[model samples]
Target: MGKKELKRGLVVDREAQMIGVYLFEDGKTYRGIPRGKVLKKTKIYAGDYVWGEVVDPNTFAIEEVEERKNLLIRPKVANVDRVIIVETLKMPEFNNYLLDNMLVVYEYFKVEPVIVFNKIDLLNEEEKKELERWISIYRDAGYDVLKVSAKTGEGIDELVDYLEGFICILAGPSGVGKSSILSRLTGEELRTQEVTTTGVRLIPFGKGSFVGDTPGFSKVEATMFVKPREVRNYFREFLRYQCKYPDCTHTNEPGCAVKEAVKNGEISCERYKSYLKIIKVYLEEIKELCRED
Candidate 1:
């Protein structure tokens, strides 16, 4: 009889080829390396729920990586609940290109993302109007936008209330005040750890929640994994206007409804441009693959 107790743990941190799992069974942590053949096809990520077979006392043979609700490319984590795309008015300047790109990335990962404009206190009348314009565009495209000033503590409570019990990631450009937002929201200074490691780590926030940090510029490069045909699905606004062709790439098609939407001001011209740029590269990628084949 091969009846042995199996324990489950969260992959808190990964080092080299092994994962560090904090088991809930006995409150003792263990290091595990996935069983031989399982490692071949499995790329375990932080936030993954893994099952381990106890080897002797503290070590485990991590064999099963359980299913995930969602995964992110840049953060390289699994089972993410929500993501906040933090943006700013000045200092680092407003970057809609970067913001839109992140939105697409979240869409590809099937993660729900909220658009947050940080440093709202810095906005003057002119900047306020500009912010309102962008807010309206994104809301029209079916996204929720929040205005929060991590500086003056305005909207910080609202953000805290919003996050509640979700495991979230605050992602944005460096100077966009993500750190400020996190410190304010948590009400305590999180201890810093060695982030120079090759693997990602999960920092616990509340009782059962964690925040993740991205490795590097892997987010942009990670877009290469998304297939050309699949790119259009991630653009939320385009789904409303289905092209006449079932396999329409939404580029150079006479029956493309997106083009008509762009013409009638139903869609953001800027967003459409971003789509074209994204799809063009994806198309060329397939062409190169074809050549290789």
Candidate 2:
């Protein structure tokens, strides 16, 4: 009989220098599909959507890559519907700058950002208080934030619940438990440890940790950026007063209601500072991107 033609997926693992595609036929299945001559030139990356046919029950021949929906530069994933940014309260602390940059990046790519705090078990009373204070700013500002523990399994059930049935991709600074969390969710021991000395990240699909398969982690650099003017709208706090001034740009306008809110302490100063930094960098990036084009 002709080989069964089925739509399958592949994940790029830079560490292993191959794409691991997951086949969801009877049970969970995986194969190491080499990123060879043709695939290499296409610039496959983690979270990229690809379509292929089953050569055998154990093998796959990639036939096409679906159109890319979103891409990131730092963690280097592609075509993801949701970018779940996981941070830590102790080892990493909240990366406000990275979080701001990622917000603009994700908004530019039209992907939702779900900010999470990992390692809740390590937090002391002070740390917990600080975490609660910090998280309140996000919550008040209308950003979704959650706290979880990989070691003690505190909020993991909620994390899984948030990720239910969605094509979610995890991204954050090194040493965060992105892999550990994924392993727990997928129930695959896929390459994790107590120590994160490796200083490298596995591509999304490689460890059988996705609902959809695509070329894995081959392209690790992110590719989404937003302009400064566009960033203010993306911020939840700015929405209430966006059109308060007809010609107001929300940057340095004299009577901008949003700017006034920041000045009057109606919104958190920390978030306002972050907002400015985001808009400035985004404008610069937009200028640079336009120059290139």
Candidate 3:
């Protein structure tokens, strides 16, 4: 008999030579498929959509990998629809630099950003107001922001409902309760004690949607690898205005719309400062990437 062809599936896990693929066309059955030469020649990480043939009841041969919407190198996931930036308001204290770094990667990759200010229950009224201010800034910049508490179940439903139709990846530093949030969203009872350190997990949401609980990143370096001029494209707010020069970096240029926006309060000064800081670091990283060529 001819090999049964499984049309398409989602790659959930990879260990050595076997890929744990969950077939979407075959009752969502998970089969461990041996790594094919095509996959070996290319990078196939978790969250990758693949098409293959089920050679036997227990064996599947991956024949194709679909194009990814975005890719992350650290936890090694692909086709990410959104990045849920989880950060605590008070516990570890929200670090702006870390948040900026995360945003830059998503911006560079053209992935949507959903900011989650977790541990809202720990905040007092003043703290809540302060958090609201921060939320307003990001919201005004055309990003979604939510206040959630994994312990109290506050805003968990809203977060889940918002993430229903997209592939999301939870990213943050350790001790931010990413696993707890995932557990609440998926009912998987994922560990809260540094659970993300284990590995990446693809938790299925509504129907075909997925949420990738990735390893908590403690350190983030500037490795966007894009040219300096391309950096401004990631900042969504910067696209609101036009510049005199087509390739204005907004650093030292006449009639720079982005700098004018900063002056006119169209963009937050804090965010503009963050943009400058990232541009400086990313410029150096871009140079390195070019040198390697």
Candidate 4:
């Protein structure tokens, strides 16, 4: 007898090309293989809503995916409802520069942002003070901040509590505990090292999804990285004044609302400085890569 058709949940780890389609049929979730054509057509990432025919009672043949409300470009993830932006309070310390850049990316993608400050146990008095300072910056910006630790399990409960119904993909700089947290949450063991570098993909999320390190950059590949011109719009306050000014890149424009937000303290000055740094880097890349022709 042929298997029945159904729609289900799916997750893709960063290590494998296969996808585990969770069939929500008959009141239980079953795992099945996702057809390659569906993967190619939709570029299936975790949190994708799918409909497919089960080739066998125990196997799935995915036919199509429902449209995504919002997708993240850098993580190369689709149907992302929220982003768990990870930062460490110790060791690697906090990179607010990268954090601001991610917030901009999150805003651009229209994904809800959840700020996570991990490695709470590693922070000493001095580190703790510094960590709190940074955390306050994010919290003041109206982002939800979670002070967590995978080792001591300090805030894991609250973290997991928030993660209960939402499908969250962690994004951050390297050496910031992405793999460690994933292991804690999913119980999937990953080989981590004392000395951290980039370009390793031993971790997989579901079947078709894999999480690999991007060399020189922490997050996944997104079109924003390609089109630096569109980077300015990602700023929360710049949307209204984008085309109003001639040559207003929003980076150094005279009447940019983004800069005004910074001056008025609507956005953190620390975040604004980081934004400038990223723009400088992107500008250099654009100059090097683009020719007059």
Candidate 5:
């Protein structure tokens, strides 16, 4: 007999082996369990779009997982269209490495990344200028960067306007007010004491849009599983100039156009530093793989 077609659902949360899914047909939530074989074979995460057979009104047996357009291992979400990277200007201080890494990861995942510098109310004119100076770097590189204060409701409306019609995920280091931003966007109350988000909760936005919040962390997994030579394709600015050699990795190759742009100040030096850091990590991983082989 042929396999039966299963109902489609969106995974809202996962705890141990049980998954909380929201069915697409009726907009009701269900508790889902994966079949033994499927559980052993596939790794599922919240924000994943899945297919399963309904065993009851409030229960389901997940049989198959749909292929994801992108996967984020840190927060363990899938099929996200945008990632709002939140950061505070002070108190805990801004982390350039985390911000830059996320930008690269989102680029690699084919998801749009918007930079949000939260807690603007705490900053003075000098501090605000400093933040804007850094923001200019990303904006010049063709990124949408926003300055907002969740405490005073600054820029919240603008942010909400930008978030319309997209599946967005909020990610940042702890104490950056990702929860506060979510509360402002969705009007949902949440405890912000925890360093990480407990369960996946999909906050509904008006007109068929939703947002998910992920735990904050200092670092995320590198997106370099592919061949080391393919890393440069994820950097958007590098595509502006064609390298003299088709095989240029933009590292140490002669006649590399990317390197020339860096010299000419076409690309931000800070961003190039991030690119080098990521490429270096990938090269090391590739070397280790060769050794193991």
Candidate 6:
């Protein structure tokens, strides 16, 4: 009776012997069927959408893997619908640069960036208020914001529900509870301490979605994919304003409207500083990624 024929799905994950496929027919990620010898050479990544034969209730044999919108190397994740920037409220105090750098990188890649503030349980009343201020700043810039605590299990269900139908990735600094929050959502036990060397992988929650978890933003190394001149466009707040020259970087440009906005309280000082830092120091750290072979 295991003859549903075939199903189409996104190759959500992979392991030593099996590939996880999220079926579009039912919108559930099944424990994929083992690859046959003939299919061994076929490499499939998380972003590939393919059709799989229904071998059994617990299996879906891959028939073929098709391509997608965009892809990334090194860490190797693709067709990402959203990049969930998971930051912490305390313990590992929030670093503005770490958060802002990622926000710019993902925006450059044309993926939606949702900010998730994790470990809220560790913060006091004043700390939470401070976080709320940060929240308002990002939301005003048109980015989605959510706050959750993995250990305390606050707002987790809503997080799970929010991720239901999209292909997403959770990224942030180490010790900010990225793995912990992923374990909470995926119901799998991952090391919650320091030292992150894991590769890119996605886990499906019982909720109808699959999320990619990686070694953290430190390993992304995305500066090469975007140039400094293109940085101004990704900053949503900076779009409304322009400078005297069409190519003004807003750093030392005389007629920069962005600098004026920051000066006039129209733009958050923290974000303006982040833009400057990216073009000056952050993006300079990595040279352009090129194939020289």
Per-model TM-score versus the true fold: 0.73, 0.66, 0.81, 0.69, 0.73, 0.77
lDDT of 2 by residue, 173-206 (tens): 7667776767666544434345333222333332
> Candidate 6 on 237-287: residue-level lDDT in tens?
877665344666776555567766666667777787677677774432112
Output the lDDT of residue 184, model 6. Answer: 86
lDDT: the better of candidates 4 and 6? 6
The candidate, 3 or 4, that scores higher on lDDT is: 3
lDDT of 3 by residue, 144-262 (tens): 89989999998988887788768787778877878788888777654334413344567787645687655434446435455555667666677666344556777766556776666
Of the candidates numbered 1 and 4, which has the greater lDDT value? 1
C-alpha local distance difference test of each model: 0.71, 0.60, 0.72, 0.60, 0.73, 0.70
Candidate 4's TM-score reads 0.69
Residue 88 lDDT in model 6? Answer: 77
Report how far residue 72 has shifted in candidate 4, in Å: 4.7
The 10-residue segment with the lowest total lDDT in model 4: 284-293
Off by over 4 Å in 2: 1-18, 27-44, 92-98, 124-126, 174-230, 243-247, 263-266, 278-293
Off by over 4 Å in 3: 1-6, 32-42, 55-57, 187-200, 216-219, 223-230, 242-245, 280-293
> Which candidate model has the greater TM-score, 2 or 3?
3
Model 5: runs farther than 4 Å from truth? Answer: 1-8, 33-43, 51-64, 186-199, 220-231, 242-245, 251-255, 277-293
**Whose lDDT is greatest here?**
5
Q: Across residues 1-293, which tens digit of lDDT does each residue of candidate 5 receive?
A: 48765899888877666688888888888998887674766888787788888888889788878888887665667777778888887876886766776666678677788888999999999998889888888888888999899999989888888887667788777778887888888877543444443655666675556687554334554454333456577677876664445567766565567766666667766676677776673333223222311
Best by TM-score: 3
User: What is the alpha-carbon lDDT of model 4 when measured against the actual structure?
Assistant: 0.60
